[PDB]
Design a protein around this ligand. Structure first.
Ligand SMILES: [Ca+2]
Ligand SMILES: [Ca+2]
Ligand SMILES: [Ca+2]
Length: 494
């Protein structure tokens, strides 16, 4: 009876500012914008603020918070074209053994973990061991020159790499060559050389430190840019210190025809890390955000379920901090609700990017980075999306069928998708109609004969199901699905 999870993804600087005293710390001053009009500066969200909002997050049935990296990031900005670029997102580390002072101290981090755990919520740390920070090997005055510190002790810089901590191979230019992706710099980010025993020990010591502060898992940033065999050894290190851990990597795929898809599969099948589900994400955005027919979604789903050895550990999502938010792609709240209902009732672990439930989006530059990281604005626990996100996670706790069940398509047309999830005798049947009101002629199901009410109680216009005994598979006849509706039927007692 494995535990089912539901993840909430928080960019700390953009979520809630609970402490004004760390907005603009003396050691790293001048990268804070109180007005929230320069989108590349720190805006002030912090660990105290996130801790204060744990009840709000718990109210959605979230079981785990994926926190953006909270390791100490560079204390001087990367100035390009005179533009101040602050490491507000956390992906430009200077010290993997310290907490970022804009977000808090070790005590603030321990309190956050304490309160999360008291609420039944795991802490998943976004960890980015591929690189430190932007560097120019010929200009040590730019940013912090990729500096790596060990709990305040400087280990070296990109321009003076006495310990040979970094690759000095230029930047990635051939993005389909695996060796280039691993051994060169992602943009101007100083690439760490995990083959160096110094770097290898440092990163493994660092992750042990964070697990000493009782985190529950890791989201591995830039997983395609490190040697697969090193990542596997990193996973082994983690497994040796905590058995019940949630490990998944960000292996970006560009689309259905990504030449490296097979390495992504190998990674997910062998390293000990699962992966974020970019194949399914593309189909989700195609069919709910771009008008494609459900055959695309169901086809992608069937493919991923046979390619990955453990699809039940894929981490699914509709948007994130590296792509436009769903509402920037298609400002349709009904389509958003349908996509949420889909990932919540689909195998694996669904992710809600913070503020989705508040319909948060900024459409500047198409909603792309940085505008997909707006400040959280409201904490309204009565929105339709909040209610939806809180109800379906309850079904995940009542049956493994949603995270761990088989998937059987019962009806696939352009705008109607009826699929069935089964685990043991547990069955959940879901019908999504993203088009106009229509009547489906015949659907088979393994639900027993009877009348099933909509689990969502009409929240998304759902309707009852009249299942007749078929002898063999049971039958529904002449089912009328309202326009823009989701109906969820289950034999699991609620
Ligand atoms: Ca603050
Ligand atoms: Ca810092
Ligand atoms: Ca690398």
């Amino acid at each position: 009876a494995p535990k089912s999870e539901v993840i909430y993804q928080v960019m700390v600087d953009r979520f809630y500012n609970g402490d004004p005293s760390n907005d603009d710390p003396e050691v790293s001053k001048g990268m804070f914008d109180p007005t929230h009009t320069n989108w590349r500066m720190y805006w002030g969200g912090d660990l105290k603020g996130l801790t204060e909002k744990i009840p709000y997050i718990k109210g959605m049935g979230v079981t785990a918070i994926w926190i953006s990296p909270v390791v100490d990031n560079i204390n001087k900005p990367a100035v390009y074209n005179g533009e101040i670029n602050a490491p507000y997102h956390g992906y430009w580390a200077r010290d993997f053994k310290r907490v970022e002072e804009h977000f808090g101290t070790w005590e603030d981090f321990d309190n956050f973990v304490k309160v999360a755990h008291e609420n039944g919520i795991k802490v998943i740390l976004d960890f980015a061991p591929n690189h430190t920070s932007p560097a120019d090997e010929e200009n040590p005055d730019f940013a912090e020159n990729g500096a790596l510190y060990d709990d305040g002790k400087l280990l070296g810089t990109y321009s003076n790499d006495s310990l040979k901590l970094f690759h000095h191979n230029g930047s990635i230019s051939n993005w389909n060559n695996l060796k280039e992706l691993q051994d060169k710099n992602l943009f101007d980010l100083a690439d760490l050389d995990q083959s160096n025993p110094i770097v290898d020990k440092y990163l493994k010591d660092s992750i042990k430190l964070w697990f000493n502060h009782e985190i529950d898992g890791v989201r591995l940033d830039a997983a395609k840019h490190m040697p697969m065999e090193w990542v596997k050894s990193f996973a082994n290190t983690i497994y040796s210190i905590k058995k019940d851990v949630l490990l998944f990597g960000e292996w970006m795929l560009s689309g259905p025809t990504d030449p490296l898809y097979g390495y992504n599969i190998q990674f997910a099948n062998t390293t000990g890390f699962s992966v974020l589900d970019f194949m399914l994400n593309g189909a989700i955005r195609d069919v709910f955000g771009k008008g494609y027919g459900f055959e695309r979604l169901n086809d992608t789903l069937e493919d991923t379920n046979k390619d990955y050895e453990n699809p039940y550990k894929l981490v699914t999502f509709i948007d994130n901090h590296d792509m436009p938010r769903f509402l920037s792609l298609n400002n349709d709240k009904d389509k958003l609700h349908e996509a949420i209902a889909f990932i919540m009732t689909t195998r694996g672990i669904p992710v809600i990017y913070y503020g989705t439930e508040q319909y948060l989006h900024n459409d500047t530059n198409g909603g792309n980075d940085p505008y997909n990281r707006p400040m959280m604005e409201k904490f309204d626990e009565s929105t339709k999306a909040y209610t939806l996100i809180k109800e379906l996670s309850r079904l995940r706790q009542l049956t493994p069928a949603l995270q761990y069940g088989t998937t059987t398509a019962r009806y696939v047309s352009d705008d109607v998708y009826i699929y069935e999830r089964q685990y043991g005798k547990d069955v959940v049947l879901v019908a999504i109609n993203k088009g106009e009101k229509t009547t489906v002629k015949t659907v088979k199901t393994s639900l027993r004969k009877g009348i099933y009410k909509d689990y969502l109680k009409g929240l998304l216009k759902g309707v009852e199901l009249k299942v007749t005994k078929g002898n063999g598979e049971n039958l529904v006849q002449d089912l009328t699905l309202p326009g823009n509706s989701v109906s969820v039927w289950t034999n699991v007692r609620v």
